[model samples]
Target: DPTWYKDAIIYEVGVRCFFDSNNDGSGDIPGLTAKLDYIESLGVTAIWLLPFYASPLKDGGYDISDYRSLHPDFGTIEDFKVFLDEAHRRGIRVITELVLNHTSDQHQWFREARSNPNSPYRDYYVWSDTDDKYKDARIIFIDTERSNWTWDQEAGKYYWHRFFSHQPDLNYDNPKVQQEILDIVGYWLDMGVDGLRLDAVPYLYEREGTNCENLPETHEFLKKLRKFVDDNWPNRMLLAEANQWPEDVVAYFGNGDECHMAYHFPIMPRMYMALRREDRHPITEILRRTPPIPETCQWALFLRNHDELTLEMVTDEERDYMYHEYAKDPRMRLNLGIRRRLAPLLDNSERRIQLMHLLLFTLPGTPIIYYGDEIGMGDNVYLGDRDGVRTPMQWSGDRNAGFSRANPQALYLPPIRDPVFTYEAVNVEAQEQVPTSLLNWMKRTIQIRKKYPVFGRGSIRFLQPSNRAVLAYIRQYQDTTILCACNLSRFCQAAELDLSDFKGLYPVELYGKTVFPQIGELPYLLTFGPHVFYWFELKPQEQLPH
Candidate 1:
């Protein structure tokens, strides 16, 4: 059904890092094109590729020069068409990153603007006579970049850049620039791309006397863009990358008139924090703070994304400590974030992987997965930059980590060849042959998730457990009741639920449909295994009124 996207399990891939068909070191569209069947076999429904357009390779491809063309290192634009067509044939929809907020300084527009003082393209980027205009603006790339305003001696102006200096922020105040972004959106939609992830939506508009983030004018423009897209192509969805606290990021939703989906950033960091500290507050507090979105909308939830784990959303001190504790290794640490992959972050524990995915799949949103995370792939921090998490897909036990015909050392980014996490030990081919492999477990869990519509639309309310180490919640949709309860600690825990409201209903476990102790006149007692959880479906008794 077209409604598949609401329940879809999306895979976030990097074109230059997923796989390589030719002997070339980098991954390409044709390489991804060759792996469509393998991806579908894992029960994924959609693919969200990072910016494939031409970039200067700064800021991990976020600095785009051409919106419609492909990066030569990845592939030609025609190769992208073939990739999309192949994915569509396999019943998978494709979504590409739309970096509307900025372009590479090397982009033709920026190049010309720098060459001439009064050039037409000069106004395309935000420039100031002095560097202190937006001094209040927080530095996003704090580790590598010193200031948001980089002095451009060529033009005798200070250019504003929200991120890295090479990536200049566009001037949305210019109507010409706004229309150009819209036209590019139209070009992609007409090219058969089903959706777009609007990169850095909050930083799109800036104003004086403000923090220069998430301005009102930004929301107005997003609503206008949404209206235009809905009128032209209703099926196309616009996802916003607003890496802020839930309360602040809620603006992107704009009463369901702006972005159709926004990343739930706070909850993600807390999920990890809850597991590390063996507490439930980090998990419950965020859900308590989350305002209900419009009925037509969905949140994009992920265990790990293509980018680093941004601490920008963790507003609480406790979670900041947890992130430091879990991601403290010098190699994994990045600019105000962590560069580690999912498996290493969790110590490659099977229970942790299952628990995280359990939360991800059952949460009230569509789940997006980083490429190699589904198979428990690890990363090599020594790879430098953020490319550690952006390694080649370990397809088999072949040479070059089974990613390409290229030599082992020639990979765009070397595959993780560590003793415990090498290609032969943790690859798709090996996992696919084994029924109990982590890949198979993910496939099964996603299958179970797809079978239940309540996961996406259900109302979630937590049932207070006796112990703070356990998390229990009820999801209700229409007449269906689903219960998900988890024990955060590595030790077993017990909890009780008051079921007097549904005294006669019996609870059927989801994994095996096994019935638990019936809900009697008293609170139903539950005992959970270490790092374990239970999923249940409630069926009403014949004696109970409809």
Candidate 2:
């Protein structure tokens, strides 16, 4: 059985925004290495670093000019080695972003491809004689880009790009290109990087008569890559970044041979929808419709990440509701969704924050916590693009938010400065002192989650209850079962779970070890306070913990 990722509690962070050990106003691998103790304290099993490869700082390092080299702003290759070694020593794995769909226009391969038509690199990228090819494909970056095909004057042809025009999409039709990607994967895995987050996976192979998304050829290429990894490198994972519906996304799993994990894009938006509507239908509908994956594969569950709250997977009506409710300001909107972070989006409500995280942890998937979300860091909507939520982490009450000693203006992006959510009031140093802080709660919650394998590796079954405000489910692994009940509403609600099958089993609350009455042939009744949730381990009387 594939138990590694199923039990992983991943923490996602961007190198440039994490910490600045050199006081250069930028976070580096060395700085991230120093923070391992803090990450480990949160019970993290893996670290997902956003693109740190050599880039021109355009598109936040996703536009890679050199895949093998580290960005000069972050650190050197040697720095990454030390960081990776230290992380492994702490029993923490690392996964970095790999943009396989495209490369920076400045990349040497692209340069050669453009200058020499007969160059072998000419086939490295997708180009068209006219802009009419692949017109069915949708433009991803709607704000700045007008067409998927951009006329390259130097190349004397139109190059294809699913995203920004500066980032041209790669052509996987060439066998050499496929082998090159395999080489890239091997290079990182050989260096002990535990896994890779394959960016824009669905757009890799475009075909006529299709929307140019999730093509069968894309799945074939992924299977080839997966086979390469399994044969050469052991215990490595490939996570597909496919922003599609759950059913369509599972196709990337390909009977447990393709990606080990894929982000559940549709489930995320529904989570917010359920909260806003004070109903469980939005969540239940999605989960009910989500197709099952191979036992070896897992879903990556998260509430927020480095990007916007992607609305591509959601319906237009639902998307409009999310915008009007969560993103009232025009600046907070991006593409088809909101660009704000967790705190600002929730109106800095501590209750809702805790409640949302409760669902995130209890949901059926490997949980990934975004950096700085522990202390409820706020966002700066005034910043361009998604930089509003990607500001430097608030570390302390000191200058530069205790991130660096460099001049304030020298920072990559200014730290959150709101009076309430400012670093001085909201940071690690401050939260560390308060036992009841969100940081401490998150730490304790993760510890509790880690103790129960049922939450991670078990099977999930939703329970039907009369009260729509309460979301209840059972996670079972062999004989072990964990019953999780969450109150999606802000008001107190009650629920009655039919535990007929578990008549003789006692419900023992996992956190406090509070024993409830044994289940009988009738309903097992329970009540929850405002924004409350629980994780109960069902056990026979003889198996109950002392």
Candidate 3:
């Protein structure tokens, strides 16, 4: 009854940055259409596209003016329909970003809510008499917006916009606004969209005396949306983009009656933190704090996305360490994050990249890979803000990184063509031909993981290791027990895994299916290369503990 997402590897792409086919500086849907095969070749199970709706181009595509219509820059609705069909034909599911919490002020409904208070749609947006009411609430876009509430002279009121003043929060307190969103959701699903990556879900409802986040009313509404989707359509998913602590974010699941997937945001940033510190405490401590999710829920984990790793989730101690270690090299740090891509962040170290992917795929949930990360594309910090990482996908050794056919001056943004991470050094055209490239390695690992569903749905228990640099864990299902060990340090590390709990059982490696000797009374010794990881399935002679 549960969907296949539990075992799926999702790939996220910004349509404007993936590729360009018409020689234009901007990427179009046809470019993505031409390259779906490239993504499929990498063994991805699904693709999550960033907002592609008609917009005024503010806040990137997140500020949407038209939910149903396609942006002129990207392509038409008909083109997207064909893309959906072609992708499905190749056994890949398609999901689009849906901004359900708010809409662009330029939207018709908001325009009406602004000009005419007596209009039927006046209550469609949240407008307060003063900005001083919700002053206690934390501003989401602190870098850009001065406060959460912005005064609108035309409306003669202070409109509540959590992120930007141009994007007004929808008044879900009104029944009409809720129904409108539900209808929009149904419209896409009816057109054969697989799922929605629900954007800014936790901030849907705001209360007077609270922090105006993760409100009870928000969860209740999500339950309604989930029920409506399930009753009418099967296999459609709702992945929430709630970037809070694991404890607060789980409510989006609503006992499996709401969003099916929410991101596990903390572990991602901590992975890099662990490597930089040369310690496992940064990783193990976070894992110990992560609470279990419902059986029908999964965590969407990724290395990077359109946004930075939010510092709000980390502790004071961890924050200080991150500021010191990663921020020391001013270029490596952003306003509050390290701006380098996966490859350049790790200095193009093949072993570290492979180790991180291994852990990402084996971790308990569905894994999402950022576009260009498969081939280890580097970031351009000079581009400023998030645009540095949102450069065009480097396809080949051709000019302009092979992304666009337009003049270099006409590009929406330049591609990363520096000596270290230029298209010649790393691109799909090159990596796809090599059997041992990072892209090929990721494909093989995904293929192996798909064969073992337990890797995604299994239960995980941390195996205490004597060597602090060695992190080990066991994943078990009904009759399958998988032992995974990783050396977090750059130095070679050895771990003594206690198999006495299931004595006389043998651990077999999943990649080659090679049988390791069965354990007797002694601990099973596991030695790993620098930044190496191993996955093994334990089998007993007769029966092992369930």
Candidate 4:
């Protein structure tokens, strides 16, 4: 279905970290293909792969050297087709990154553009005689990069770069560059990929006096790209990585014509804050301010991803508090974000881990599960940059955490070896056998979530109960109603929700099947244990008409 993406439970995968079938110390397409059975069984309807395109490995393949083919380390384009087919066979859709804002400095276009100003390729990238253009645009890479323009001796000028200096920004003002991106997108779709994650879409167009983000020209280009996809490949999807505010992000949807979905960038950070502060305001405030998008468009919510837990959307006060509260170690900080995995960020608290995932699944939009997070993986702060949270998926306790047959030293990154979260103790193989393991619980939770269409497409109405530690909300779709109540506190909490509208409905537990008293005119009372949650189907005695 064209609308399948709205309900998709997406699993984010860094192909290089998933598995290494060839023992080349890097994962290949075949390695990813071989694991489809496991992925399908995990209950995610789709997978979002980080860029596998040819690159210099700077910025984790986002700096695409060749948009036309796969990186040699990831195997051939033919290998990707086979993997796409295999994933499709299992009814799983694939969404891979399409880096639109820039290209690797090693790309032929950039090489030719810089080497000779007279070359037609020179117009492919943004360049200026001085580094004074777009003075209003803020520097993004605060950790390493100093400016958005890098001086190139070869070009005798400075070129604009929103990200790393190695990845120069593309000149979207050029019609040929616009055509070039459509052709690249077209090529990938024709190769049988199901969807795209358009990387850094907000920075596609830059202006002299503006911030160079969420520019009108970027939306125009997106509309054109959306039109091309609809006219040619109708079933495929385009997801924007705008990293902007909700009002600005809704522009990407453009009456449901631009992207099918955009990541809810602020929600992730606020969830952490809400949990830390034990209050519902942080989550509620953001949601209240979020403007509505086109009916067909949706938000993509994630617990953790290959990148850092982005704090860019939060206030300076919240950002500093997050660093103080979570990033006790300075090394965990990366460019205004905290680079910690799901397990370690919560200090390996089993209750809090499941609580976070439970809230994520029931909340609005399509939920995205980060690879290895289901198994409760930990990060290595010493690994440097954001690589700490992106360690290889711990499959088993065997050599290289059963990720490869290669020498331990040859692995892309070492497996978690700390006694608490070591591969031997926290791997998928070990978790699979334990019924109560985080992995098994996640699988079961996802299975439960899939059964309730209300969680995916329903309208959310938050209950403003007196207790601030409890977040209670009603999810309704036509006649189906679901009450999702979560405890944001570390201590036991009681909450009363006014379910007076559905006076005669009984609360049947979604997973446990335990029946609770029917709703009445008085405020309905419920109490939760520390870090606990409940999902109930508010069923009436007589079925309502559709």
Candidate 5:
């Protein structure tokens, strides 16, 4: 039953930040359900929801206190069920976050473990007499966390945590813990959730000598989870958020069974790198080195997401280049990353934005769009942590940005107030009225992408063009051929492509359906305007039987 995730256009959204159904100042599941039509209109196939599980509101809901229930701020379990049903009715699959690595300190199991050493739940989390057990493991949140182990005053022991101390790492070595996580997986899959985005996947298992990232034990557990999902759920997917190199990331997709998808973290930064340098080597180099994933599995590619633009996996030189080009202000930079939205990062250039989206759709994986990015939502640098980019979704130029009717002070986080990215200026209602809007462009692009299976399922061949400012690739599946050429420069560029093998075929533009001259034996020449992108459907002159 493993279907077409390869062709899926995923839209990443946060429950509390999407829309407020009632005047409660917080977005709930019901609110999201109300906007199903808006999301459906965008032509994305799936919705990737941030964690909505019961939490203490620490770490942006990553610190889950209970996996069985929804946060009261979001709504009841019944509301989530309704949302799931409505999404399915619209042919949209839902993938919620499954934070398997850790749970909030307020969780019942953690509370019990700390209160009594002899309790059965004491072993549910990793604990030690000393904080020196896993010194090699890197602290993920370096801005706040000093060490991987935090001393618990009540328990008189140090607890292991790769992330924040409030979120204690779970003991995957314990069989009972594994069983409970499996049950948690079943609990949601049974409730009709199409998939689970495994959060902090690589840090699940810790061994003393290693960095405790992408360990062999982690793969084994994921395989067990995959086995259960495949045996029980039919078409559900498991996506890993392992921020590692492509070679290591592929391990999470063990054979064809472990994870159905993993985020290609390296490519994202390289995409920006290619743009800033006005060269295609940064992108081509990574793809060239990226090992082939299982045919049943795919990579989840994106321009931006809920978190910062991670510079962890890149080299020192590349990281410095990104810092100089993207984040000029040191305050805007986070630990090994730059916290900014796509529009701001691209300097609000519509052409460059479209160019990036074109590459995202044409790349060899399912593309994911961050919420509000389609309408060019901006971020607030004054907001603390990553909350700047996690502001409310701009639905209209109404009260509270049409996200809520409650008092501004009552909002979970204030809606972005920047003049350029203000909800009053950049909301959906305004964009929907303009046929030439970025939102409309994204919608059309997604629709056209669905028309060609080659963009998703086909093998990619990089076309070596003489112009370094251009990135040209051909995607071929059976009889279908798609030529995607993107100009990364701010100036007009020309390229001579070697399409000798495709000489007889004529190029028909996918977007406009305009037929161009047939490819000749000589080097096929093409010119592009500044920040131009093209998707040409290469058709044979002799029409084939439909």
Candidate 6:
């Protein structure tokens, strides 16, 4: 289906940290290929692999050195084809990163462009004789970089970068660079990859007096990118990774002609804010502000993913509040966000964890689950940088958490060793048997979500109950209706919903299948425990299971 992406259950994979076959201590294509059955069983329809392209491995594979081949540490091009075949064989689609925004300083394009003025590749990247250009462009990495321009000693010219200095920004103004990216994109889609997540898309084009993000030229480039996908591979999708407010982010969808999907960046932080503040206003306000896009477009929502849980979309006051609440340790805060995983940020509260995921899945748009989060995995804050959240998957209580057969010292980024969240306490093997475990809960949730397309494709109608902490909404499709009510509080709370429209229908709990009181003319009353949530299917009394 051309719009199959709308119903996708995306699982973000950390290639290096996922699993290691051949005891190489780094996750490889063969290892990921072997895990297809496990992912298929979890009801995942799609997997979004972080860049496995040839890179210096700085910036977690975002700094691509070669766009046409796989990193040697990952596997060969043949291994990738096998992995893609294996994924599709199991009915799971795969999308990898297309990082066009920048390339590693070691990239041939940059290397040749750097040291020579008249080199053909000199114009491949944004270059300046002086570092004073683009003064209005804000520095992204405030903690590490003082300026976006870094001078090359050999070339004696400064190159502009939107991210780390090691990664130089590509000049979208140059038609050759645009064609190079377009051809690379064609190569990936041609290789049978289901889709491409365009990384750092907002900085593709920098204007003279702008913040160097989400510029009009960026959208122009995106339209060109979209045209290639539509004309040749209409079934394949493009997901834009632009971290802007809801209003600005929708522009990437451009009459549904640009990206097929974009992440709902603003809504994520507020979900945490609503839960922490014990109020639904934050979540509701952000959702309300989100402008509607073309029917062909979808927003990708996440509780957490590869990067820090960003606070860039929120106000200064709210950002400070989030800092104190989630990043209690100084080392946890990085750049404009906190560099911690979902489990640690939520204080490892199982109830809170489930609640947060329920919100992520039940709310509008497709839901993305970061790898290891299904098993309530913890982070290694001491690891520093985003590496803390990108640790190895905990598959067992056995050696190296069953991730690899290599020596512990050889493992790429240590698995969580914290007593509370160590592999022994929270591994897939152990939780597989425990019905009450987070892993099982995640499986059930994913299955339930898959069973009901209403949750994914339905229209969301907010239901205002008297209680402010209870977040209630109705998801309706052609003939199916699901009422989702959640308590965003630690203490027990109650809500009186006006379900008069369904006056003669019985509310059947989705998971439990327990039939509740039938709705009447009066406001329907319900009480909930701390952090509790319910998904009820509104059915006519006659339609109830006899």
Index of the highest-lDDT prediction: 5
Q: Give the TM-score of candidate 3.
A: 0.95
Considering summed lDDT, which 10 consecutive residues are worst modelled in model 3? 537-546
Instruction: Please give each candidate's TM-score.
Output: 0.96, 0.98, 0.95, 0.98, 0.98, 0.99
Q: Model 4 clash tally?
A: 0
Worst 10 residues of 6 by lDDT: 537-546
lDDT tens digits, residues 1-546, model 1? 434568778899888877888877888889888888888988888999988888888777899888878889888878888888889998899998889899999889999998897899989989898888876889987888888998999989899998889999999999999999999999999888999899988998888878998888999899999999888876888999998878878778889788888888878988988898788998898888987777788899987876777776665586469556877776777777888888888888999899999999888888998888888998888877677888888888888667888766777677788988888788888888888899999888888888788998788888776788888888888888888888899998888877676677888877777777678999888887988978888876652322
Tens-place lDDT per residue, model 4, 1-546, is: 888887899999988888898898998789999988889989989989999989898788898999987888888988898998888888899998889999999999999999887998999999899888889998889988889999999898999998999999899989999889888988989877888999999999998899989988889888889999999987888999878777897788998879989888867888899999999999999988888888888889888888888888778899899999999888889998888998899999999999899888998789999999898899888887788887888899998888999988988889999889899888989988989988889889999998887787889999999999999999998878999898999999998999998899988888887778889899999999999989999987664222
| C-alpha RMSD between model 4 and the true structure | 1.8
What is the number of residue pairs that collide in model 2?
0
lDDT per residue as tens, model 3, 10-71: 99998899888888799989899999988898889899999989998787789999898988
Q: Which of the predicted structures, 1 or 2, would earn the higher lDDT when compared with the native?
A: 2
What does the lDDT come to for candidate 6? Answer: 0.90
lDDT of 5 by residue, 1-546 (tens): 475688799999999999898878999899999999999999988999999989998889999999999999999999998899999999999998989999999999999999899999999999999988877887788898889888999999999988889999999999999999999999999999988999999989999888889888999999999999989988889999989998998899999979999999979999999999999999999988889988889889999998999998999988999999999999789889999999999998999999999999998889999999999999987898899999999988888889999998999988878877788888999999999999999999999999888887889999889799999999998889999988999999999899888889888888888888889999988899999998898888676222
Candidate 1 — what's its lDDT?
A: 0.85
Q: Which stretches of candidate 4 lie over 4 Å from their true place?
A: 542-546
What is candidate 6's lDDT per residue for 1-546, written digit by digit as tens?
998988989999977888898898999989988888788877899999999989999899998899988898889999999889888888889998999899998899989987788999999998898888998988888889999998889888888998999999999899999999989988989888888998989989888877888888889889988998888876999999988888889999999789999998988899889999998899889888989989988889898998888887789999999999999888899988999889888889999999999988988789999999999998887886788888899999998999999998999888888988898888999989989989889999898888888877889989888799999999998999999999999999989999988889999998978999999999999999999999999998778874
TM-score of 1: 0.96
Residue 323's lDDT in candidate 3: 70
lDDT of 2 by residue, 31-81 (tens): 998889999998899999999999887899999999999999889999999
Q: Is candidate 1 or candidate 4 better by lDDT?
A: 4
What is the TM-score of candidate 5?
0.98
Off by over 4 Å in 6: none
Per-model CA lDDT versus the true structure: 0.85, 0.90, 0.84, 0.89, 0.91, 0.90
> What's model 4's lDDT at 496?
92
